[PDB]
Design a binder for these strands. Sequence first.
RNA 1: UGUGGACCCGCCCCUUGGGGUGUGUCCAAAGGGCUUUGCCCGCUUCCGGAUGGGCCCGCGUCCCAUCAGCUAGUUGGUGGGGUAAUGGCCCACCAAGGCGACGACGGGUAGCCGGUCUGAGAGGAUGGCCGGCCACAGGGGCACUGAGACACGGGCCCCACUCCUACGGGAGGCAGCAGUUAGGAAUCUUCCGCAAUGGGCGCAAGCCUGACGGAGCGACGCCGCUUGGAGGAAGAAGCCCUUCGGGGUGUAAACUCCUGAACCCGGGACGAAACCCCCGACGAGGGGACUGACGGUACCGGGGUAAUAGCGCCGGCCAACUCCGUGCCAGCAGCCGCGGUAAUACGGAGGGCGCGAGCGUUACCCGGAUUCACUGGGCGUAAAGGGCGUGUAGGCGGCCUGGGGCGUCCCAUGUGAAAG
Lengths: 104, 83, 138, 124, 208
Amino acid sequence: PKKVLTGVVVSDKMQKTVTVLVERQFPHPLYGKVIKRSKKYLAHDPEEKYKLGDVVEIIESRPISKRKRFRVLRLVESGRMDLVEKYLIRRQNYQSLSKRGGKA
Amino acid sequence: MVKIRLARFGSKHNPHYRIVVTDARRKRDGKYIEKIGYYDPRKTTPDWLKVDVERARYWLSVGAQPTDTARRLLRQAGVFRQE
Amino acid sequence: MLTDPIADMLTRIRNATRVYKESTDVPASRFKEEILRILAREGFIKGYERVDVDGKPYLRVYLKYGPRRQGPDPRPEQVIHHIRRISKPGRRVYVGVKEIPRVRRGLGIAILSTSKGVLTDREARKLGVGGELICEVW
Amino acid sequence: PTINQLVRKGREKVRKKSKVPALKGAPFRRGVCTVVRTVTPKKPNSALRKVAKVRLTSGYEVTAYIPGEGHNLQEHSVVLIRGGRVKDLPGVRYHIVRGVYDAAGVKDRKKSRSKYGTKKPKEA
Amino acid sequence: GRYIGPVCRLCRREGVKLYLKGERCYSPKCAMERRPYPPGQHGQKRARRPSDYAVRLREKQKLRRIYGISERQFRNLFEEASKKKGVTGSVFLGLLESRLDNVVYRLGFAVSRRQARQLVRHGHITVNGRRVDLPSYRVRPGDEIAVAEKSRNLELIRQNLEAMKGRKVGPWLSLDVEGMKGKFLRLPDREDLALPVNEQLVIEFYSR
RNA sequence: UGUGGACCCGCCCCUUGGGGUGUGUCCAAAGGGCUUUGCCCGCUUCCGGAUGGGCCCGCGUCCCAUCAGCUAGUUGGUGGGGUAAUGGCCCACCAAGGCGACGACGGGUAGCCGGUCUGAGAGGAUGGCCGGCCACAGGGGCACUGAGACACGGGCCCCACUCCUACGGGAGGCAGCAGUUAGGAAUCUUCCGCAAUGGGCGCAAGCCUGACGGAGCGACGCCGCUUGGAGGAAGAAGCCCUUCGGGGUGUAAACUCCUGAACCCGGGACGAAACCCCCGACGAGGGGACUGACGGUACCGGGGUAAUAGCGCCGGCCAACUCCGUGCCAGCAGCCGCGGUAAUACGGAGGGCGCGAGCGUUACCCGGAUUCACUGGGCGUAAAGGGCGUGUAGGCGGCCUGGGGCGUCCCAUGUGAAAG
Ligand SMILES: [Mg+2]
Ligand SMILES: [Mg+2]
Ligand SMILES: [Mg+2]
Ligand SMILES: [Mg+2]
Ligand SMILES: [Mg+2]
Ligand SMILES: [Mg+2]
Ligand SMILES: [Mg+2]
Ligand SMILES: [Mg+2]
Ligand SMILES: [Mg+2]
Ligand SMILES: [Mg+2]
Ligand SMILES: [Mg+2]
Ligand SMILES: [Mg+2]
Ligand SMILES: [Mg+2]
Ligand SMILES: [Mg+2]
Ligand SMILES: [Mg+2]
Ligand SMILES: [Mg+2]
Ligand SMILES: [Mg+2]
Ligand SMILES: [Mg+2]
Ligand SMILES: [Mg+2]
Ligand SMILES: [Mg+2]
Ligand SMILES: [Mg+2]
Ligand SMILES: [Mg+2]
Ligand SMILES: [Mg+2]
Ligand SMILES: [Mg+2]
Ligand SMILES: [Mg+2]
Ligand SMILES: [Mg+2]
Ligand SMILES: [Mg+2]
Ligand SMILES: [Mg+2]
Ligand SMILES: [Mg+2]
Ligand SMILES: [Mg+2]
Ligand SMILES: [Mg+2]
Ligand SMILES: [Mg+2]
Ligand SMILES: [Mg+2]
Ligand SMILES: [Mg+2]
Ligand SMILES: [Mg+2]
Ligand SMILES: [Mg+2]
Ligand SMILES: [Mg+2]
Ligand SMILES: [Mg+2]
Ligand SMILES: [Mg+2]
Ligand SMILES: [Mg+2]
Ligand SMILES: [Mg+2]
Ligand SMILES: [Mg+2]
Ligand SMILES: [Mg+2]
Ligand SMILES: [Mg+2]
Ligand SMILES: [Mg+2]
Ligand SMILES: [Zn+2]
């Protein structure tokens, strides 16, 4: 079966492509506690239909470009920028960790 | 093509072949598609040839070619007996 | 705010027994309740009860010990010698029905929550289920 | 440390330091004597110990010890070495195999002959 | 046979008669009678508390010298009996006791195992009427161990089965004195073996 | 010629480029042999199968954060090129994206796996024979031919190296089998055979095959086997102790009898029955003929000789003690430690212990080591609480009810090749 993943659109910044963030809980091999971990998929949105913060199912599919091998299947749950802002702060923090620091 | 033939499996001076179906291009003792029988040419035990004529015939029915002895062994375990 | 309330209860108990109290209040929750039910069945506690210490609901647990002994230090033998949390928050511990613990060669229980309810090690073995290994008691 | 800590960092596997850089891993290494010296031992032991600064095929100049009653090594003796602390002489970490190349088997030995490399004495 | 060398010095070291030579070990001439101390210079000096380790060593040697097996040969037998299903102490004995060399000894074809090891390497012995010239061949139960038709009368085997007329042979073996046949009926049980050795100790030694 | 197939447009079902359909266009072929009208071997197109492959995706896959920022075909879009096929694979134009503390980028190391060693296990270590995949063929690029290659024993070019050279110009590529040389502690025959198994071509006869089947060398490993067996003194001789009475090596030896490795003689294999040919029909089936490198080996039978034993250890750990010699020397030593004139620790001897065609040493891996602790550890003084706060991400989260069912649990099922 073509793998189907469910995630959150965190990018509209391209044409006919949305970036989906897909989490996955699983117990850790050695230490056992259940760890989150998540990966961004570039997904194909030909209609620029899905918006920033939509929750979408994504489907394994024939290549559309480098990076793009999934197309956006159905809409699951409409808007929610909580997950986005979450992901947004995550990336913003990167500003601090380097050789310098201050007021981000 | 794809062959029915013997693969060597005994030891030095102690030969036992496996009657196997394989792409003719593998090494003789390499990964095969399917074993369908075995063969001790020394007749050391009373059970020294075994085949399974159903699979033997299946493969034939899709034009696996037997070797000049696989066909020989096959025959002897009545693969080709049609009466 | 108690981080793990199942463990606070397993402990409250352990602390009470170790100084031979009569009974002890643990704040109420169906789940805690669901557990004590088992402790009773297997005889580790005389019983539990839904008392009400000032407005909010507790579970009076009544403890059971041994008889008095002879020698220096008479203090009776605990019926609950040992009672420990197996699965804790930030390290959950689930076992399949094939790997449910044999506790003390069975002179003791292990309590696991399953989709068929809170059960003992032998209870889940019959029913043919695993779940979340909550604690061993023996 | 917390489980979560052991998740973030981990444990840390250990590392073996070779008590003998006879390179290549090898069980023996050939070399050439550049100094046959004598060394004073330590702590609670006095004597005159036989030693040889040896230039190895492994491109290593190391000091190796010369076991046995007495030797025959000179400042150009090709020699085969083999690893072994001499407890007393600190910084002496290999032995010279006796009976290989220029170094000769200990003469007139009857007891532990394979160490010291001396042939079975004849009898008829 | 194997080992090869003064044997009664072993009788002496283990402090027990081991009977590594048939005749004579029933005479008043085995050294253990009227010389029962260890061999060598310090034989007659008093002893010291042998270590835990020491005890397990000798107890092994005692067993292992009784059969004249090597040790790589012996260790393999014990290792197999270890892996093997069932109680490893008793099973080990059964494997030792199933060796053709010793089965020949037991049936009194030979007066001792050393001699029995010869009778075998020299093909005087048949198993199921076919010559087996291997002292460590394993006799399974049902097998019939005979003297070889054309051996069946050397000065030695004649005189040796002559004594076997009217002597009793172990519960787990039946012997025929006439046709010089003989059978392995069942793997001997631990109790059957009256071995001067605590086979348990032996197990401790190999698990050091 | 159009069975059929390809392509453009339209309609139909399907749902990504799947399957049908109607015009229009476009596309086939090879001959050979005969015991010659009748079969054998070939050819063409299409559909289907079998095998073998391409590509794409989820998850897994070492160390350094004393590498923290990275990217411009970069990230996406449209159109085209290319391919068997998707795709920034390549190209033009447009948009300004993409990745990173869940470790990007960089640096180091490394073929991966089935498996192997160890471990009670969880783990740790490894990827050597064998089998699977990958990558490579003196170093670097590149295409051509073809079902397939960017092609080890095909082509082109540049580079480094060797050899021929008439000075212009050529020829090579053992990481195929043997073999030589160099390096190294160290690693084999320039062997026999296509008899078997397998491969290529051939209608077959057959040809080719350093694949392969065997032999050779090396105690390198595993297993098996011998150097004898039974008798034999109050107990030789020599050697060694001693309280000078003795005690030890020691049933050991001698010697008596018995068996008979080696060695000689004779018989002598299995692996091989197919291809082929005859009858039947060139099918099923039956009949016959040929063929063995190993090898006069294995195995059998007759004859027959008492016929190699080493190596390490003996203070404690650790099985095994006595004399002499040496004098903080000579030396031993895995760790503790021995030797300074009575050394069971050095060297010899007698004796003893352990293994035994091997015994030791060195090297390395796991173990013991709960000594990186998930199982399974710690931080007042043993090493370990951050000088203190505020707070980001992250981790964690009271009581009651309901929905979902992501974790978790259960059943059925597919997969988990062979070898191990
Ligand atoms: Mg020594
Ligand atoms: Mg047409
Ligand atoms: Mg369509
Ligand atoms: Mg169409
Ligand atoms: Mg048409
Ligand atoms: Mg035409
Ligand atoms: Mg014609
Ligand atoms: Mg296919
Ligand atoms: Mg651009
Ligand atoms: Mg494009
Ligand atoms: Mg940028
Ligand atoms: Mg490499
Ligand atoms: Mg462990
Ligand atoms: Mg490999
Ligand atoms: Mg080269
Ligand atoms: Mg070549
Ligand atoms: Mg050449
Ligand atoms: Mg060299
Ligand atoms: Mg051939
Ligand atoms: Mg062939
Ligand atoms: Mg004798
Ligand atoms: Mg004779
Ligand atoms: Mg004879
Ligand atoms: Mg032929
Ligand atoms: Mg005919
Ligand atoms: Mg026929
Ligand atoms: Mg003799
Ligand atoms: Mg001792
Ligand atoms: Mg001196
Ligand atoms: Mg060492
Ligand atoms: Mg002295
Ligand atoms: Mg002194
Ligand atoms: Mg000494
Ligand atoms: Mg010592
Ligand atoms: Mg460990
Ligand atoms: Mg500690
Ligand atoms: Mg401190
Ligand atoms: Mg503080
Ligand atoms: Mg401080
Ligand atoms: Mg927070
Ligand atoms: Mg909660
Ligand atoms: Mg939460
Ligand atoms: Mg619910
Ligand atoms: Mg679920
Ligand atoms: Mg398998
Ligand atoms: Zn005796």
